[PDB]
Amino acid sequence: MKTRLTNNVDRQSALYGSSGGTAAQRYEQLRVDRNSPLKRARDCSKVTIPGLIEDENYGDAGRLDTPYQSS
């Protein structure tokens, strides 16, 4: 159906095509650099709030632990 995740305030006509690669390729290229800060944030979240930032395989059927301090 109507994919509207963008507002109707600034839509225009088609101005750019596929001049060099696809967005998926750039996303795959930049995930390499994005990797480590995600791990740091995940560890910090685990030590403060167990289920805020999640692993990709801890969704519908994932179990979270609890810490031994509530500060």
Partner: protein
């Protein structure tokens, strides 16, 4: 850690009375403690958000355009 996270529990001094002026003084301390974060958030979030807000509002034509300097 409690002093670092600016919670209200470490503020209490058990045993003896604390004056209202003392409480205001240490409240000033806690407000001072995160001034850098308040400043950076004020510079980064508020201004672009309101600017985009006025731009969208003007494009919607619910208010005429702002006068511009000659």
């Amino acid at each position: 850690l409690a002093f670092a996270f600016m919670l209200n529990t470490a503020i209490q001094r058990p045993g003896e009375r604390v004056t209202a002026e003392e409480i205001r003084y240490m409240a000033q301390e806690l407000d001072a403690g995160i001034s850098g974060l308040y400043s950076i958030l004020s510079r980064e979030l508020q201004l672009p958000l309101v600017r985009r807000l006025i731009h969208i509002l003007r494009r919607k034509r619910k208010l005429p355009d702002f006068p511009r300097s000659e």
